[PDB]
Design an enzyme around this catalytic site. Structure first.
Site, PDB file in Angstrom:
ATOM      1  N   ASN A 174      44.006  43.471  31.136  1.00 39.20           N
ATOM      2  CA  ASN A 174      43.864  42.329  30.234  1.00 39.20           C
ATOM      3  C   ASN A 174      45.106  41.450  30.092  1.00 39.20           C
ATOM      4  O   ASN A 174      46.239  41.933  30.139  1.00 39.20           O
ATOM      5  CB  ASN A 174      43.410  42.813  28.854  1.00 39.20           C
ATOM      6  CG  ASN A 174      42.445  43.983  28.936  1.00 39.20           C
ATOM      7  OD1 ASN A 174      42.857  45.140  28.862  1.00 39.20           O
ATOM      8  ND2 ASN A 174      41.173  43.689  29.190  1.00 39.20           N
TER       9      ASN A 174
ATOM     10  N   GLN B 156      65.953  44.611  74.366  1.00 37.46           N
ATOM     11  CA  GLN B 156      65.080  44.494  75.534  1.00 37.46           C
ATOM     12  C   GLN B 156      65.142  43.137  76.217  1.00 37.46           C
ATOM     13  O   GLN B 156      65.157  42.100  75.553  1.00 37.46           O
ATOM     14  CB  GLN B 156      63.638  44.788  75.148  1.00 37.46           C
ATOM     15  CG  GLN B 156      63.400  46.215  74.742  1.00 37.46           C
ATOM     16  CD  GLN B 156      61.938  46.562  74.743  1.00 37.46           C
ATOM     17  OE1 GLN B 156      61.364  46.837  73.700  1.00 37.46           O
ATOM     18  NE2 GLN B 156      61.312  46.496  75.910  1.00 37.46           N
TER      19      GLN B 156
ATOM     20  N   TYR C 241      46.715  31.039  29.322  1.00 37.55           N
ATOM     21  CA  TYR C 241      46.985  32.376  28.797  1.00 37.55           C
ATOM     22  C   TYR C 241      48.473  32.680  28.938  1.00 37.55           C
ATOM     23  O   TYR C 241      49.053  33.371  28.105  1.00 37.55           O
ATOM     24  CB  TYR C 241      46.177  33.432  29.563  1.00 37.55           C
ATOM     25  CG  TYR C 241      44.795  33.700  29.006  1.00 37.55           C
ATOM     26  CD1 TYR C 241      44.592  33.846  27.635  1.00 37.55           C
ATOM     27  CD2 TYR C 241      43.696  33.854  29.852  1.00 37.55           C
ATOM     28  CE1 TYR C 241      43.331  34.145  27.120  1.00 37.55           C
ATOM     29  CE2 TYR C 241      42.434  34.151  29.347  1.00 37.55           C
ATOM     30  CZ  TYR C 241      42.259  34.298  27.983  1.00 37.55           C
ATOM     31  OH  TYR C 241      41.018  34.615  27.486  1.00 37.55           O
TER      32      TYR C 241
ATOM     33  N   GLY D 163      37.867  41.968  25.257  1.00 36.53           N
ATOM     34  CA  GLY D 163      38.552  43.224  25.520  1.00 36.53           C
ATOM     35  C   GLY D 163      40.054  43.144  25.359  1.00 36.53           C
ATOM     36  O   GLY D 163      40.792  43.943  25.939  1.00 36.53           O
TER      37      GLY D 163
HETATM   38  C1  F43 Z   1      32.395  31.955  30.195  1.00 33.78           C
HETATM   39  C2  F43 Z   1      33.394  32.850  29.501  1.00 33.78           C
HETATM   40  C3  F43 Z   1      32.954  34.305  29.589  1.00 33.78           C
HETATM   41  C4  F43 Z   1      33.984  34.987  30.468  1.00 33.78           C
HETATM   42  O1  F43 Z   1      33.926  36.134  30.922  1.00 33.78           O
HETATM   43  N1  F43 Z   1      34.980  34.191  30.712  1.00 33.78           N
HETATM   44  C5  F43 Z   1      34.916  32.760  30.148  1.00 33.78           C
HETATM   45  C6  F43 Z   1      35.136  31.714  31.087  1.00 33.78           C
HETATM   46  C7  F43 Z   1      36.383  31.909  31.972  1.00 33.78           C
HETATM   47  C8  F43 Z   1      36.629  30.823  32.977  1.00 33.78           C
HETATM   48  C9  F43 Z   1      36.319  29.332  32.395  1.00 33.78           C
HETATM   49  C10 F43 Z   1      36.318  28.297  33.484  1.00 33.78           C
HETATM   50  C11 F43 Z   1      35.178  27.321  33.431  1.00 33.78           C
HETATM   51  O2  F43 Z   1      34.994  26.649  32.371  1.00 33.78           O
HETATM   52  O3  F43 Z   1      34.451  27.172  34.445  1.00 33.78           O
HETATM   53  C12 F43 Z   1      38.143  31.108  33.338  1.00 33.78           C
HETATM   54  C13 F43 Z   1      38.961  29.899  33.690  1.00 33.78           C
HETATM   55  C14 F43 Z   1      38.202  32.233  34.419  1.00 33.78           C
HETATM   56  C15 F43 Z   1      37.783  31.706  35.791  1.00 33.78           C
HETATM   57  N2  F43 Z   1      36.613  31.970  36.285  1.00 33.78           N
HETATM   58  O4  F43 Z   1      38.593  30.989  36.457  1.00 33.78           O
HETATM   59  C16 F43 Z   1      38.575  31.678  31.879  1.00 33.78           C
HETATM   60  N3  F43 Z   1      37.606  32.067  31.210  1.00 33.78           N
HETATM   61 NI1  F43 Z   1      37.867  32.044  29.082  1.00 33.78          NI
HETATM   62  N4  F43 Z   1      39.609  31.068  29.156  1.00 33.78           N
HETATM   63  C17 F43 Z   1      40.549  30.800  28.283  1.00 33.78           C
HETATM   64  C18 F43 Z   1      40.308  31.026  26.756  1.00 33.78           C
HETATM   65  C19 F43 Z   1      39.163  31.455  26.290  1.00 33.78           C
HETATM   66  C20 F43 Z   1      38.865  31.506  24.823  1.00 33.78           C
HETATM   67  C21 F43 Z   1      38.806  30.023  24.316  1.00 33.78           C
HETATM   68  C22 F43 Z   1      38.601  29.810  22.798  1.00 33.78           C
HETATM   69  C23 F43 Z   1      38.552  28.325  22.428  1.00 33.78           C
HETATM   70  O5  F43 Z   1      38.382  28.044  21.207  1.00 33.78           O
HETATM   71  O6  F43 Z   1      38.673  27.447  23.322  1.00 33.78           O
HETATM   72  C24 F43 Z   1      37.426  32.136  24.755  1.00 33.78           C
HETATM   73  C25 F43 Z   1      37.532  33.581  24.188  1.00 33.78           C
HETATM   74  C26 F43 Z   1      37.966  33.589  22.755  1.00 33.78           C
HETATM   75  O7  F43 Z   1      37.218  33.043  21.905  1.00 33.78           O
HETATM   76  O8  F43 Z   1      39.074  34.147  22.453  1.00 33.78           O
HETATM   77  C27 F43 Z   1      37.015  32.143  26.192  1.00 33.78           C
HETATM   78  C28 F43 Z   1      35.776  32.514  26.536  1.00 33.78           C
HETATM   79  C29 F43 Z   1      35.206  32.580  27.958  1.00 33.78           C
HETATM   80  N5  F43 Z   1      35.877  32.690  28.967  1.00 33.78           N
HETATM   81  C30 F43 Z   1      33.690  32.454  27.954  1.00 33.78           C
HETATM   82  C31 F43 Z   1      33.219  30.917  27.756  1.00 33.78           C
HETATM   83  C32 F43 Z   1      33.463  30.376  26.360  1.00 33.78           C
HETATM   84  C33 F43 Z   1      32.810  29.024  26.246  1.00 33.78           C
HETATM   85  O9  F43 Z   1      31.571  29.055  26.362  1.00 33.78           O
HETATM   86  O10 F43 Z   1      33.460  27.962  26.054  1.00 33.78           O
HETATM   87  N6  F43 Z   1      38.051  31.795  27.042  1.00 33.78           N
HETATM   88  C34 F43 Z   1      41.595  30.850  25.946  1.00 33.78           C
HETATM   89  O11 F43 Z   1      41.626  31.105  24.724  1.00 33.78           O
HETATM   90  C35 F43 Z   1      42.920  30.479  26.534  1.00 33.78           C
HETATM   91  C36 F43 Z   1      42.977  30.736  28.013  1.00 33.78           C
HETATM   92  C37 F43 Z   1      41.804  30.180  28.712  1.00 33.78           C
HETATM   93  C38 F43 Z   1      41.682  30.328  30.256  1.00 33.78           C
HETATM   94  C39 F43 Z   1      42.222  29.197  31.050  1.00 33.78           C
HETATM   95  C40 F43 Z   1      43.680  29.129  31.143  1.00 33.78           C
HETATM   96  O12 F43 Z   1      44.380  30.139  30.824  1.00 33.78           O
HETATM   97  O13 F43 Z   1      44.220  28.052  31.534  1.00 33.78           O
HETATM   98  C41 F43 Z   1      40.263  30.581  30.467  1.00 33.78           C
HETATM   99  C42 F43 Z   1      40.043  31.644  31.567  1.00 33.78           C
HETATM  100  C1  LIG Z   2      37.700  46.684  36.006  1.00 29.89           C
HETATM  101  C2  LIG Z   2      37.770  46.570  37.503  1.00 29.89           C
HETATM  102  O1  LIG Z   2      36.601  45.989  37.959  1.00 29.89           O
HETATM  103  P1  LIG Z   2      35.325  46.830  38.575  1.00 29.89           P
HETATM  104  O2  LIG Z   2      34.606  47.448  37.426  1.00 29.89           O
HETATM  105  O3  LIG Z   2      35.882  47.858  39.499  1.00 29.89           O
HETATM  106  O4  LIG Z   2      34.401  45.871  39.312  1.00 29.89           O
HETATM  107  C3  LIG Z   2      38.942  45.737  37.923  1.00 29.89           C
HETATM  108  N1  LIG Z   2      38.935  44.438  37.393  1.00 29.89           N
HETATM  109  C4  LIG Z   2      39.935  43.969  36.519  1.00 29.89           C
HETATM  110  O5  LIG Z   2      40.625  44.826  35.930  1.00 29.89           O
HETATM  111  C5  LIG Z   2      40.144  42.581  36.397  1.00 29.89           C
HETATM  112  C6  LIG Z   2      41.276  42.085  35.471  1.00 29.89           C
HETATM  113  C7  LIG Z   2      41.712  40.622  35.425  1.00 29.89           C
HETATM  114  C8  LIG Z   2      40.583  39.755  34.833  1.00 29.89           C
HETATM  115  C9  LIG Z   2      40.332  40.082  33.331  1.00 29.89           C
HETATM  116  C10 LIG Z   2      41.561  39.747  32.560  1.00 29.89           C
HETATM  117  S1  LIG Z   2      41.530  40.038  30.793  1.00 29.89           S
HETATM  118  C11 LIG Z   2      38.969  45.686  39.483  1.00 29.89           C
HETATM  119  O6  LIG Z   2      38.497  44.666  40.041  1.00 29.89           O
HETATM  120  O7  LIG Z   2      39.478  46.660  40.140  1.00 29.89           O
HETATM  121  O1  LIG Z   3      60.386  52.965  73.850  1.00 28.06           O
HETATM  122  S1  LIG Z   3      59.244  53.305  72.932  1.00 28.06           S
HETATM  123  O2  LIG Z   3      58.098  53.879  73.726  1.00 28.06           O
HETATM  124  O3  LIG Z   3      59.711  54.307  71.894  1.00 28.06           O
HETATM  125  C1  LIG Z   3      58.689  51.818  72.076  1.00 28.06           C
HETATM  126  C2  LIG Z   3      57.963  50.819  72.984  1.00 28.06           C
HETATM  127  S2  LIG Z   3      57.838  49.216  72.162  1.00 28.06           S
HETATM  128  O1  LIG Z   4      34.883  35.400  26.587  1.00 29.02           O
HETATM  129  S1  LIG Z   4      35.622  36.579  27.158  1.00 29.02           S
HETATM  130  O2  LIG Z   4      36.437  37.247  26.081  1.00 29.02           O
HETATM  131  O3  LIG Z   4      34.627  37.563  27.744  1.00 29.02           O
HETATM  132  C1  LIG Z   4      36.719  36.029  28.480  1.00 29.02           C
HETATM  133  C2  LIG Z   4      37.924  35.222  27.983  1.00 29.02           C
HETATM  134  S2  LIG Z   4      38.704  34.365  29.367  1.00 29.02           S
END
Ligand code: F43
Ligand SMILES: C[C@@H](OP(=O)(O)O)[C@H](NC(=O)CCCCCCS)C(=O)O
Ligand SMILES: O=S(=O)(O)CCS
Ligand SMILES: O=S(=O)(O)CCS
Lengths: 436, 545, 248, 545, 166
Positions: free
Chosen positions: D477, D143, D329, D441
């Site tokens: 997860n 065009q 992780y 989980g």
């Molecule tokens: C608040 C929660 C509940 C939840 O749903 N998620 C959390 C928190 C969340 C936050 C923590 C950020 C912050 O501090 O503001 C983030 C980074 C997710 C986010 N929102 O960005 C995360 N977890 Ni968690 N979280 C982690 C981990 C873990 C491990 C830590 C065990 C230890 O001894 O330190 C435990 C679970 C377990 O026991 O297996 C854990 C729990 C938890 N996890 C417990 C808080 C535990 C505490 O009070 O210190 N995380 C890990 O084990 C490795 C990965 C790591 C993530 C960050 C990264 O991957 O760099 C982070 C991944």
């Molecule tokens: C379960 C489901 O969440 P809802 O129950 O629909 O709010 C789903 N989340 C997740 O699966 C989040 C996974 C990543 C964070 C946890 C990692 S272990 C989603 O948002 O579609």
């Molecule tokens: O010529 S066509 O009408 O098919 C497309 C216009 S961008």
């Molecule tokens: O502490 S929880 O197992 O719920 C989340 C880990 S990042």
């Protein structure tokens, strides 16, 4: 294979029932519940009136200013109903039923089975029943042609712009086909809170309704088929239809002093006494048990899972730890025996993610908002959701998102229907007659 | 209105029917297109695979290639500077909308008290917002040994509170508050407070860089996560406990608001994507109703500009197709003050014959206002062969005249559906007038249009406010979508309404900490056209010098 | 049965799971100091309720409700509160998944979560304070290798402090070497207490190993327990087989 | 293998169980986290809304905050430099995959002849590619008066041909050809030619900037449009004629290939998004099988690195959640050569007891290889308290040991499903070993794992190659997804296979005109960690200085 | 697909997982197992007949199975899962390679939304591909319509019209 069937009070209601009679395609009551689920719809007339009264349509905080419209829907509920059964009836002698409920605030619309029959989409009844409400409001309430589209929106929300009836005032147990996690997941996409609301907090009847809906999807998805049909037939008898009175008897004796561990031990003893399982070999102190019948062993463990929840969560009167119960019932039950837990791992599997997603930041929610179609609880093939329904029924009021918040309409209108509210009597009766 | 631009673009009088062609030097008459070859040359040199090449296929510029005055401004630029890919402001407008999620705070706060047993007061709510503004951009509040996100990449991320509870409103730190009474004219302010009620909200704006790497359905998941992290921190519950799942569910489903909802399987997309955004909502994002309450035309024109851009250039011209795209399909309705002239005159007509927003919605008013303005607009193109040569496609011609007609009919009635019905009369008039309408599938909508406009059936009936790129007729073709938003804005501007369909989204996009300036979309586009706009999300900190 | 295993750690695992096995008391903490550690309420004030008591409620027509007796806090309508433990990999007496197995055997109305670095139990408030006492003063707790923490739980897989304590980023407990006892100066969320709560007397490495539940190369190697490794491989086999075909 | 890094990160011997804490200066021990506050301060100053703030909630760095040697390299960096948002290479890896669409050319060429009556020869095919490489980045071919896209923004967009018809292959310009015989080792080359057959393909790589503004389902629509424009130009048919609709349908549906397919309603997403990308396909994107054919472990380890990164950090840690995210992780499986040691030793075991890929798939081999390597890996963490303190979460501990176990079982059998079954044995072993497994989980998958691994039912049965983040168990997860891709690669590397599941996607990602280097993902990550990686899509040309 | 390990469709091949089974030759035996798994009553309208020398197979489920079916496409799951099982224990498929039969039949499901690269088909296709509620009977290709009415114009018009108007 012949299970005895007992009611919600532990009394016997049917003798030697062949488990083949309990499949959806053999059982008449289950067949009819599926029909009644495609044809039964709830409409909130008060909600449509409010929406139209304030031009708050589409839902979620929306308001179209200057398009408010004072019509009286509730007061003419009777007249609206009459127009609806006119548009909806197929024959003079069919099962069309369109009755106003709760002083005209609500409306149950049951389509003629003739309309079901030729319906592919299971939720579709909502379109039909809803479009009736739409038309019936327009030419009873004398709605202006230019403002009629506001009635469409009060009823069906943002549809078709949204995938669903977002901000609408139409509901069924089913919801829209494109929200399904897979083929045949339709009857799985029904909230536990819906299940519990419609069985009006009756625990045994909730368990039942959840189980029969679950196991009917198990058949539809080709899971209960081939070398698996028996796994689900027996699994279903014991879990949802109180087979052998096993769920009821375990809870009668463990209900005052028992835990999840004592229920686990109750399962191992009864399978032991019935020759379901034996001793394979004896390690240096502890018995490894084998299964003489893998399907009936699963069925046995599965029944004890429902009992495990009923005793445990019932003691707390809090739903919450149903996720721990399912997790640890199967955890214990395996390391007590040397055999797989319910659903060969998947049952405990579901409860691990369930526990997580009911106790963390990332998603999920409280127990009642899950269902067979939630990605968090879709994994187990019918053996986890019926436990979750027992727990949410035994709740004295600890949940924010309870059946009264999420599942109000369903509880009020569907609660009035008998086979919804009390499906046990109907399925077992159907199963008796079917066995001749 | 379009004369000044018509005399700058064209040597001849706007009236003349004749000119010279084939005498401009072909491709190389244009500053931009020269720049492009330079960069292409350097690219192919370093690369080894041929790239942009003028000499392939068609020789552009056998006619003079136009400049365009962005309407309402005095900036003239080449067409190439208004492609969304070449324009940072255009990208940043979409970015600001996509990265916006608004979450209800009410049931969350209820949970803390009824279930977790912690008091919720303004003192704790402010503490919470200090936390959320640490947590949203990627800061750590609970776990030890947490890695974090560079604030230099996320300097545009933040959160604020919207609340119609005026008693809580002036207890919240001003820096955490999108103040309805400060931002809005007195009467729009009160209309908004009434519509919102004593419900209080959390407006989260994610980092633009996250929309760059991910997508729109990321946006709310991200909002929900950091909101729950901040509640945990500020109210000293267990960092992982039963009632926390209420926060997840309130934020993600029960009390959530997104700019767009998901789309069906063939155009499969999650939330906060352009096709899920309704006309009334896109209209309430634009903030021109705030600054020019007494000019219904400017407010509508401004909504058309960012509608056509978003829906034709970015949405239909990339998401749904791609390539060179649909720049001038959109530009036909915001350069050269051509549509502006048609719209203003149509308002002068309505202002006379009827009152502004005073006409009963009826077939009579549509039949009158629609026909008058369509004949006017058609007659301007055949009076000024210059304007005809500017708007060379019929699609954009149909769109300019139908928009003017549609909005005008909205100006009289103050009712979007009536206005829409006038659009569909206008189009079917254009058809028989010039013996054409638009491109091939242009009039799918407009031929279904009359019957579906007032219909109430399944996938047919719905007020225009609530319609969008997922309304079945509307999902495919250019020169419609943004213009419809203009009709929604026109109806509601004529009435003096503060918003078209959403109170909260309106207040949210009034906030002065956004990057794009939503009061004045056209002026922003020229700012991006002149390469003067500073976007977020650029990664020059984490990259070699 | 409880649990298969031919080694010492496996036996401490049937012991803590067994509601017949009396848990050997090492401490004595008053009820007021348990309420303070779990800083949910002030010990003088009454119990907050999430819903009104069952003895005055519209109790639904349910034949299952009649069979199951509610707990104390259920009848009063108590709010569900928690207590969270972090157990060190270095020979802490009790460990997350084993904690939960003990709970599901020992106690009624239990919600619990076993994670890697944390373990939490959630039940009615008054019943939680009674459960917490047993968990805190018996051989299942040790104030050096096990910490009370509901936030910032980081420390279980971490090496020990110079004083032989687990890491606490929030510094909830301190070592009072004047008494030789470990005492908490903050609650489980990190808010400073009015006066220290002595839960002290940390055990030496020998007593911990004699009552540890973790398999360790520098203790009882996982590789050694062949009967446990045979049952866990049996669950794997029968699972994979049944999932393919129930059988025959 | 992990000793050198363990002695660089830790003052003490790796063997020691004791150290000092609370003596590092808290937050401010780290170069990065200091930088972040500086930028936060400047942001809040200019802005007026608080941003990043160390003093909120938790004081990071009461323990020493670790550096990480990216495994296989000698680069040590802070954890904060391996967040995908902070790392340009990580963003560019995803970008290159998302912007890749491959389209069949066969039925298109058939149409030109059978329906449009135009001859298709190598001469015209080359002409066509000169055109496509003008048209893809936004150049005009048909065009008049077309605006165009700045080549400076799109210098990474281009197209090439893949063809197993070797006779056509060396008739195509070398600059338009992804040469299978040049790029691959002799035997991998022949395995690919055989698998592809005499079918010829069009590999289109869209501009990264377009993925930044839009999404993945844009990618193929964009490919399809410019392919049809180029056919029109090069073969001189009507620019809009019946048979053109065959081009639209061949390119968009009948002969198309995308890196990912769409996702269901709850995680609603179109194509070319991370969750729609299968393990076998992500594995065939990585090109380490090309360079290290005789080291099954490196090829697998390298696939884990870009799997965990893509699926945990970008996919699960942003798309599906968001916030601070899941850096470590993922890092648990590509820093510090910890998993590397476990995997290599497991291969030495298999190499001895069985042969490489010589074992019959059976429960016996799984029971042996899985248990041996899991006990080994568990025993390394309790021997070296330093490595235990490095991998502080159990999730990443479970993942490192299960990956080693899983890939090892794959090394013996050469069969992904067997390998996967070993993963699920390993996990349930870890459980009883430490009295824990992962986060809450974590083990949903792994407890369903044994029964679903060999199952054949509806939403249960499927070879691991074909599985992905949409396989029901796998959708939620962390610490699983990328490791599974490693098992797919392990099986196929042990056999010497050129690819795991897709011949064409494999060849496509071998092309040297990509931006990310897919042969060596780990080394690229460190390049991005050190801010030495030059990404595409940056808008510094259209923005003020 | 099973002979060449080309499963999942669209150019894919899982190398080293090839598997020589004879399906066509045992089509009769496979059919018989299928009507065994699928029948509800001895006197119902189950019909499972081999077509085109065993290359094709029509599986008609008993109306008893329809009756209690919400998802209209679901019959494919049921009928297909029969084919899956019937192949495994007629062709004596190894437990570890059985998942290859699942894939040859149902493609990439469940990873894809549909049976991508599968060998199962009906007039209907998957509920989440619907443009709206009740669009099931609308999602049937005109070419499907024309193929099944064997290029008879009046009968094509009819079949399209009755499906549309229903
Ligand atoms: C608040 C929660 C509940 C939840 O749903 N998620 C959390 C928190 C969340 C936050 C923590 C950020 C912050 O501090 O503001 C983030 C980074 C997710 C986010 N929102 O960005 C995360 N977890 Ni968690 N979280 C982690 C981990 C873990 C491990 C830590 C065990 C230890 O001894 O330190 C435990 C679970 C377990 O026991 O297996 C854990 C729990 C938890 N996890 C417990 C808080 C535990 C505490 O009070 O210190 N995380 C890990 O084990 C490795 C990965 C790591 C993530 C960050 C990264 O991957 O760099 C982070 C991944
Ligand atoms: C379960 C489901 O969440 P809802 O129950 O629909 O709010 C789903 N989340 C997740 O699966 C989040 C996974 C990543 C964070 C946890 C990692 S272990 C989603 O948002 O579609
Ligand atoms: O010529 S066509 O009408 O098919 C497309 C216009 S961008
Ligand atoms: O502490 S929880 O197992 O719920 C989340 C880990 S990042």
């Amino acid at each position: 294979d012949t299970v005895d069937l007992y009611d919600d009070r532990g009394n016997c209601v049917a003798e030697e029932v062949p488990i083949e009679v309990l499949s959806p395609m053999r059982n008449e009551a289950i067949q009819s519940i599926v029909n009644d689920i495609k044809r039964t719809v709830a409409v909130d007339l008060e909600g449509i009136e409010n929406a139209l009264q304030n031009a708050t349509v589409g839902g979620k905080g929306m308001k179209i200013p200057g398009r408010e419209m004072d019509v009286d829907i509730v007061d003419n509920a009777e007249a609206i109903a009459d127009e609806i059964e006119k548009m909806i009836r197929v024959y003079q002698d069919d099962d069309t039923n369109v009755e106003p409920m709760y002083d005209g605030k609500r409306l149950l619309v049951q389509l003629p089975s003739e309309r079901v029959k030729v319906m592919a989409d299971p939720y579709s009844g909502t379109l039909q029943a809803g479009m009736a409400v739409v038309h019936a409001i327009i030419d009873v309430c004398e709605v202006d042609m230019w403002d009629a589209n506001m009635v469409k929106a009060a009823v069906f929300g943002r549809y078709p712009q949204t995938i669903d009836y977002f901000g609408g005032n139409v509901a069924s147990m089913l919801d829209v086909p494109m929200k399904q996690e897979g083929v045949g997941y339709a009857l799985r996409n029904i909230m536990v809170n819906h299940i519990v609301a419609a069985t009006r907090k009756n625990t045994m009847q909730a368990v039942c309704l959840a189980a029969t809906l679950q196991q009917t999807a198990m058949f539809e998805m080709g899971d209960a088929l081939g070398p698996f049909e028996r796994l689900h037939l027996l699994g279903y008898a014991y879990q949802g239809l109180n087979a052998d009175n096993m769920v009821y008897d375990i809870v009668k004796k463990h209900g005052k002093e028992g835990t999840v561990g004592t229920v686990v031990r109750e399962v191992v003893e009864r399978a032991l006494e019935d020759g379901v399982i034996e001793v394979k070999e004896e390690l240096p102190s502890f018995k490894v048990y084998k299964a003489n019948d893998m399907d009936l062993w699963n069925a046995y463990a599965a029944a004890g899972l429902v009992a495990a929840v009923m005793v445990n969560q019932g003691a707390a009167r809090a739903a919450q730890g149903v996720s721990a119960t399912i997790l640890y019932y199967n955890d214990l039950l395996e390391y007590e025996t040397g055999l797989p837990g319910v659903d060969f791992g998947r049952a405990e599997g579901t409860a691990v993610g369930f526990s997580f997603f009911s106790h963390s930041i990332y998603g999920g929610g409280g127990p009642g908002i899950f269902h067979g179609n939630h990605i968090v609880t879709r994994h187990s093939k019918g053996f986890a959701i019926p436990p979750v329904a027992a727990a949410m029924a035994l709740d004295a009021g600890t949940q924010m998102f309870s059946p009264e918040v999420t599942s109000k309409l369903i509880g009020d209108v569907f609660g009035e229907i008998d086979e919804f509210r009390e499906p046990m009597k109907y399925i077992t009766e159907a199963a008796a007659e079917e066995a001749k | 209105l379009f004369m000044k631009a018509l005399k700058e673009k064209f040597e001849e009088s706007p009236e003349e029917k004749y000119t010279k062609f084939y005498i401009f030097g072909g491709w190389k008459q244009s500053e931009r297109k020269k720049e492009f070859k330079e960069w292409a040359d350097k690219i192919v040199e370093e690369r080894g695979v041929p790239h942009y090449n003028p000499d392939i296929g068609v020789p552009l510029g056998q006619r003079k290639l136009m400049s365009y005055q962005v309407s309402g401004t005095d900036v003239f630029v080449e067409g190439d500077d208004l492609t969304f890919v070449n324009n940072a402001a255009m990208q940043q407008m979409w970015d600001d909308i996509r990265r916006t999620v608004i979450v209800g705070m009410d049931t969350a706060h209820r949970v803390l008290e009824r279930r977790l047993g912690k008091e919720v007061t303004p003192e704790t709510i402010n503490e919470y917002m200090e936390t959320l503004n640490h947590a949203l951009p990627g800061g750590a509040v609970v776990q030890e040994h947490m890695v974090e996100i560079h604030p230099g990449l996320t300097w545009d991320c933040y959160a604020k509170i919207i609340t119609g509870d005026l008693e809580l409103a002036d207890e919240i730190d001003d820096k955490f508050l999108i103040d309805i009474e400060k931002l809005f004219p007195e009467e729009q302010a009160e209309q908004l407070i009434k519509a919102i009620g004593n419900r209080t909200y959390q407006v989260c704006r994610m980092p633009t860089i996250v929309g760059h790497v991910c997508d729109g359905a990321t946006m709310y998941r991200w909002a929900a996560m950091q909101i729950a992290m901040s509640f945990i921190c500020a109210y000293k519950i267990a960092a992982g406990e039963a009632a926390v799942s209420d926060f997840a569910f309130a934020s993600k489903h029960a009390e959530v608001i997104n700019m767009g909802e998901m789309l069906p399987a063939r155009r499969a997309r999650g939330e906060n994507e352009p096709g899920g955004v309704p006309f009334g909502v896109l209209a309430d994002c634009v903030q021109t109703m705030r600054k020019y309450p007494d000019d219904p035309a400017k407010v509508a024109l401004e909504v058309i500009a960012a509608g056509a851009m978003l829906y034709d250039q970015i949405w239909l011209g990339s998401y749904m197709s791609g390539g060179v795209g649909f720049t001038q399909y959109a530009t036909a309705v915001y350069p050269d003050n051509i549509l502006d002239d048609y719209v203003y005159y149509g308002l002068e007509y309505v202002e006379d014959k009827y009152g502004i927003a005073e006409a009963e919605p009826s077939m009579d008013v549509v039949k009158d206002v629609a026909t008058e303005v369509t004949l006017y607009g058609l007659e301007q193109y055949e009076r000024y062969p210059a304007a005809m040569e500017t708007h060379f496609g019929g699609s954009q011609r149909a769109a300019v005249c139908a928009a003017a007609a549609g909005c005008s009919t909205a100006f009289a009635t103050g009712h979007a559906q009536a206005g829409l019905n006038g659009w569909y009369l206008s189009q079917i008039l254009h058809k028989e007038g010039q013996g054409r309408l638009g491109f091939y599938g242009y009039a799918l909508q407009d031929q279904c249009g009359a019957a579906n406009s007032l219909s109430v059936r399944s996938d047919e009936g719905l007020p225009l406010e609530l319609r969008g790129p997922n309304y079945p007729n509307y999902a495919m073709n250019v020169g419609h979508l943004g213009e419809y938003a203009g009709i929604v804005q026109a109806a509601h501007a004529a009435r003096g309404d503060a918003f078209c369909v959403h109170p909260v989204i309106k207040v949210a996009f009034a906030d002065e900490n956004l990057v794009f300036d939503f009061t004045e979309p056209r002026k922003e586009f020229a700012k991006g056209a002149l390469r003067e706009f500073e976007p977020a999300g650029e990664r020059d900190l984490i990259v070699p010098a | 049965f409880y649990y298969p295993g031919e080694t010492d750690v496996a036996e401490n695992r049937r012991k803590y799971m067994n509601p017949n096995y009396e848990l050997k008391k090492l401490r004595e903490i008053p009820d007021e100091d348990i309420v303070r550690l779990m800083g949910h309420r002030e010990p003088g004030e009454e119990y907050p309720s999430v819903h009104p008591p069952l003895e005055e409620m519209e109790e639904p027509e349910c034949p299952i409700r009649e069979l199951v007796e509610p707990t104390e806090g259920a009848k009063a309508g108590d709010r569900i509160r928690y207590i969270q433990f972090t157990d060190s990999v270095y020979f802490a007496p009790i460990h997350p998944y084993i904690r939960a197995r003990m709970y599901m055997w020992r106690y009624r109305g239990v919600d619990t979560g076993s994670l890697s670095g944390r373990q939490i139990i959630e039940v009615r408030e008054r019943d939680l304070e009674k459960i917490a006492k047993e968990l805190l003063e018996t051989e299942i707790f040790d104030p050096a290798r096990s910490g009370v923490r509901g936030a910032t739980v980081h420390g279980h897989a971490l090496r020990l402090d110079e004083n032989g304590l687990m890491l606490h980023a929030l510094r909830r407990y301190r070592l009072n070497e004047e008494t030789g006892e470990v005492e908490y100066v903050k609650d489980q969320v990190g808010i400073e207490l009015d006066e220290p709560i002595p839960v002290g007397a940390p055990a030496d490495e020998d007593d911990l190993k004699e009552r540890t539940t973790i398999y360790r190369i520098d203790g009882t190697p996982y590789r050694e327990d062949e009967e446990l490794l045979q049952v866990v491989q049996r669950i794997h086999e029968l699972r994979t087989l049944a999932g393919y075909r129930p059988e025959e």
